[PDB]
Design a protein around this motif. Structure first.
Motif, short mmCIF file in Angstrom:
data_model
loop_
_atom_site.label_atom_id
_atom_site.label_comp_id
_atom_site.label_asym_id
_atom_site.label_seq_id
_atom_site.Cartn_x
_atom_site.Cartn_y
_atom_site.Cartn_z
N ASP A 291 0.82 -1.20 0.00
CA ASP A 291 0.00 0.00 0.00
C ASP A 291 0.86 1.26 0.00
N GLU A 411 -5.81 1.10 -6.10
CA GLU A 411 -6.05 -0.34 -6.06
C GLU A 411 -5.61 -1.02 -7.36
N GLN A 415 -2.72 -3.90 -7.73
CA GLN A 415 -2.92 -5.16 -8.43
C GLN A 415 -1.79 -5.40 -9.42
N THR A 436 -1.37 -5.14 3.01
CA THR A 436 -2.32 -4.43 2.17
C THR A 436 -3.68 -4.35 2.87
N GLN A 437 -4.40 -3.25 2.62
CA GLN A 437 -5.79 -3.15 3.04
C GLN A 437 -6.73 -3.14 1.84
N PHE A 438 -6.22 -3.34 0.63
CA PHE A 438 -7.07 -3.39 -0.55
C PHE A 438 -7.90 -4.67 -0.52
N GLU A 439 -9.21 -4.49 -0.74
CA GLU A 439 -10.17 -5.58 -0.64
C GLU A 439 -9.88 -6.64 -1.71
N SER A 440 -9.49 -6.23 -2.92
CA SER A 440 -9.24 -7.21 -3.96
C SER A 440 -7.97 -8.02 -3.67
N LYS A 442 -6.22 -8.44 -0.21
CA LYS A 442 -6.17 -9.12 1.08
C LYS A 442 -6.33 -10.64 0.92
N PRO A 443 -7.27 -11.13 0.09
CA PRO A 443 -7.36 -12.56 -0.22
C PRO A 443 -6.22 -13.17 -1.02
N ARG A 444 -5.58 -12.40 -1.91
CA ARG A 444 -4.46 -12.93 -2.69
C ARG A 444 -3.26 -13.11 -1.75
#
Ligand SMILES: O=c1ccn([C@@H]2O[C@H](COP(=O)(O)OP(=O)(O)O)[C@@H](O)[C@H]2O)c(=O)[nH]1
Ligand SMILES: OC[C@H]1O[C@@H](O)[C@H](O)[C@@H](O)[C@@H]1O
Ligand SMILES: [Mg+2]
Length: 452
Positions: A291, A411, A415, A436-440, A442-444
């Motif tokens: 971030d 964001e 990516q 990271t705090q990016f929603e797309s 955090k799962p990666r």
């Protein structure tokens, strides 16, 4: 060992301000038996302005050295300088130790005035001296005055330790003194003081036994220490240094400011810079702080250029400023639109507008700036600095003359960085943590976390 007869000042980023130059000139003039050196980084500096600055300094009999040419820029220091918004306090805190190890001499901040000349010879029992004075206070510890003999082992140990401290900066916990510092002063100041500044120096001197058990961060108690590490071998206030009550120090590093020319770089150049920087973080610590990089990269200020004539190649969505051909001539500003067409911007009359709206007009304030330029054919380094600053932030009321600065969002950039880094199998394998705090994303980060 004798302190080498050199006085070192550092200024990285843009050109040293005129006020600081005056401070350095006063040191140089009052201490003619010492070589006065200003250290710069040509790799991030604006070339034309730095060249003019260097010529000015030569004319004044001040040596200018480049940290890369002289081999004193460690990869850790290069890492901070290549950030889009470097912490120049951290950089300077690290450079001063490397410079002193390489050359010996006296490091001084440019916000300390010379009250008395140094002795012709300073002799240091352990080849290293500190001042008990800093920023108008006595019996204190700071890193803004440091003297050593070339190659001194204490200074070398400090240079090595500060590299390690800096490399570990993301792991800095705000506990003890730094809990409260964070609260009052902000994370940036607290972190700088503890990782590379006087808080780092305190802890290191305690670990090396230079400061004993009676010394505390809020109370150094030099009068209970080994005073052979002090200039003049005493806690007494030195004759040499002065600041005014009304300005004990400049805090010039506290603002976070884009380094020169970022707004003129391509996206691809900026992205590749971030990738190289991320790679260093990963290789050295295993931390991928996504971030930080994406939030720097998302910033697009106005592109701009100051020239003598219209070029073959223009930059779309930018300002082009043309110097008068003679000192009495007029300047021409164009807005180069997104189709690379010149749009002459009208600079309003400076004298004839007393309405508060006209006083606030960005273009009137710009014209007034241009009008203060001493010789418009040959602007000084400082005049170019101020013009460039105005153009970066120029936002006319007229939409037709306002840069667009269309740019990817944070964001999307994150990516792209994620994909670039993790597609390298070697780097991917060296990652231990990603912030990271990016929603797309955090799962990666979870999915890699478990892959390991
Ligand atoms: O744009 C900047 C601002 C600061 N500095 C460096 O940061 C040091 C510390 O700045 P200052 O003395 O203003 O900080 P303070 O002593 O108030 O903490 C300076 O001597 C410079 O070497 C720099 O290189 N570029
Ligand atoms: O650590 C950041 C800054 O801290 C101040 O205490 C020092 O006087 C500066 O020289 C240093 O750059
Ligand atoms: Mg200072």
């Amino acid at each position: 060992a004798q302190i080498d007869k050199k006085i070192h000042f550092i200024w990285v980023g843009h050109i040293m301000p005129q006020k600081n130059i005056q401070v350095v000139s006063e040191w140089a003039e009052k201490n003619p038996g010492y070589e006065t050196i200003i250290w710069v980084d040509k790799k991030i500096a604006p070339a034309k302005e730095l060249d003019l600055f260097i010529l000015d300094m030569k004319s004044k009999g001040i040596t200018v050295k480049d940290i890369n040419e002289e081999g004193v820029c460690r990869d850790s220091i290069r890492h901070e300088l290549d950030q889009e918004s470097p912490n120049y306090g951290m950089v300077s805190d690290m450079l001063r130790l490397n410079i002193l190890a390489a050359e010996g001499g006296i490091y001084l901040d440019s916000d300390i005035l010379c009250s008395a000349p140094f002795p012709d010879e300073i002799y240091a029992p352990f080849g290293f001296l500190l001042s008990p004075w800093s920023q108008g206070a006595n019996n204190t510890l700071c890193n803004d005055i440091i003297l050593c003999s070339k190659g001194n082992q204490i200074i070398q140990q400090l240079a090595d330790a500060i590299e390690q401290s800096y490399i570990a900066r993301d792991s800095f916990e705000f506990t003890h003194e730094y809990a409260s510092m964070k609260e009052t002063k902000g994370e940036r100041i607290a972190k700088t003081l503890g990782v590379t500044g006087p808080g780092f120096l305190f802890h290191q001197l305690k670990k090396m036994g230079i400061l004993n058990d009676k010394s505390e961060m809020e109370a150094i108690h030099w009068e209970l220490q080994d005073q052979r590490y002090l200039i003049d071998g005493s806690v007494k206030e030195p004759d040499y240094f002065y600041v005014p009550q009304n300005n004990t120090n400049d805090a010039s590093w506290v603002p976070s400011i884009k380094r020169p020319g970022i707004e003129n770089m391509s996206f691809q150049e900026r992205l590749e810079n971030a990738v190289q920087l991320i790679a260093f973080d990963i290789q050295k610590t295993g931390l991928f702080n996504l971030d930080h990089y994406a939030n720097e990269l998302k910033v697009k200020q106005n592109s701009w250029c100051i020239a003598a004539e219209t070029s073959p190649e223009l930059k779309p969505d930018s300002y082009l400023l043309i110097r008068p051909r003679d000192k009495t001539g007029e300047w021409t500003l164009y807005y180069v639109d997104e189709d690379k067409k010149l749009n002459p911007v009208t600079l309003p009359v400076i004298k004839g507008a007393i309405k508060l709206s006209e006083v606030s007009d960005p273009l009137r304030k710009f014209h007034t700036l241009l009008s203060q330029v001493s010789d418009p054919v040959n602007p000084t380094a400082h005049e170019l600095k101020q013009i460039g600053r105005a153009l970066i932030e120029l936002k006319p009321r007229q939409d037709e003359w306002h840069c667009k600065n269309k740019w990817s969002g944070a964001e999307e950039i994150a990516q792209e960085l994620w994909q670039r880094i993790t597609s390298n199998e070697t780097l991917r394998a060296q990652i231990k943590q990603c912030f990271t705090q990016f929603e797309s994303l955090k799962p990666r980060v979870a999915e890699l976390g478990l892959e390991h």
